[model samples]
Target: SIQAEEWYFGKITRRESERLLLNAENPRGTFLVRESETTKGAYCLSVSDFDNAKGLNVKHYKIRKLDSGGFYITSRTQFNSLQQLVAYYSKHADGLCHRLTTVCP
Candidate 1:
């Protein structure tokens, strides 16, 4: 999410932030944890592209799993393992929906 990105970087604008969260949020959302394509794995892909002249605008991100818990997204990121991911999102869920649903909560 653009807003979700805030929990990480701090270069987004008010408009961009809301647009992201509005376009890509939903609790209990499942996504494609892929390094390849189908004939490979199933996943959900929702990306937020921004045009801020002064935003973090990360060039890339890596979503990985860790034994510790939760998910490791980006580098100086948080707890890992999609396992913990469900737990965190579940516990922190406010009004998000399913990634598949694409329903902005």
Candidate 2:
């Protein structure tokens, strides 16, 4: 039987999905990493856009693999806000954060 899809990014790590985005070619966009076909009217999102964000703040997940691996996390603290969650990964680049990069349709 077929299985249901993950509405979020979940534990999709770069090591787990190095080829998920890269076609071994350079592109002008960041990879969705783990993608979902449905996001409209379900999940809502808010972020700093061009109005109050910053100057050219662009950071891709930028994935490459060492070897295939299992799923896990690398967080060592609690997150009270969405920015905190993103900041953690930006600083450490080890923890597993999901539900990101999902665009609402």
Candidate 3:
């Protein structure tokens, strides 16, 4: 079984969220690939403006566990073991999607 979530530009009316999503890619939603297992990992692949000079391009990819609670990346090839994945991601923490502290009412 596979579950997916797709967020598009016109889906929301919020400016900030829309800008954030669109800033990465133009049109279409981001792709998230996951494996079905006891411990499933997720990979976010998208075409984004990594560089301001380039108009629209796809190069880097972000990967993480479905329930790991943070965003990280690894080679699209294969991960031998969970420990290897953790180590790789830990050393390359890019802070691309780091959570910001906010007040909740």
Candidate 4:
């Protein structure tokens, strides 16, 4: 349920998502989920980070879909919904650039 959480950004473009992240409070770990710009039924996770090694403070991870209708990040740990995915990542940075700290408000 995208509407279950304020972080779900629906079909916003990657650039738009970045713009939202750039304005978020606390900066680090702030994130939003958006529909993949070029992939139907797919989603992207954009996160703000403190690291500048890549010359960019924002990082993106593709939230992949499983044949069983679940979702995954870097691999394994499938989730039944976007909310579950966000919940898992919020508590642990895991492979993400940073643990989710705030929504793109």
Among these predictions, the greatest TM-score belongs to: 4
lDDT of 3 at 43: 40
Candidate 2's C-alpha runs over 4 A off are 1-20, 23-76, 96-105
> Per-residue lDDT of 1-105 in model 1, one digit per residue for the tens?
322421332343434434544332323232222231222221222323234563322122244544454354443545544444434543553322322222223
Among the numbered candidates, top lDDT falls to 4
Residue range 1-105, candidate 4, lDDT tens digits = 675668887878888887777753556888888889887777899998875565447888888887788888866688987788999999998778889988878
- TM-score (all chains, Cα) for each model: 0.26, 0.25, 0.28, 0.86
Worst 10 residues of 2 by lDDT: 42-51
What is the alpha-carbon lDDT for the whole of candidate 4?
A: 0.81
Clash pairs for candidate 4 = none
Distance from true location, Cα of 98 in model 3, Å: 12
Candidate 4 TM-score versus the reference: 0.86
Candidate 2 residue pairs that clash = none
Q: Quote the lDDT for 78 in model 3.
A: 41
User: Which lDDT tens digits does candidate 2 get at residues 19-103?
Assistant: 4433323232222323222432121121111213442222233222122321212223445433444444444534332224432
Give residue 91's error in model 1 in angstroms: 15
lDDT of 1 at 84: 46
Candidate 3: worst-modelled 10 consecutive residues by lDDT: 96-105
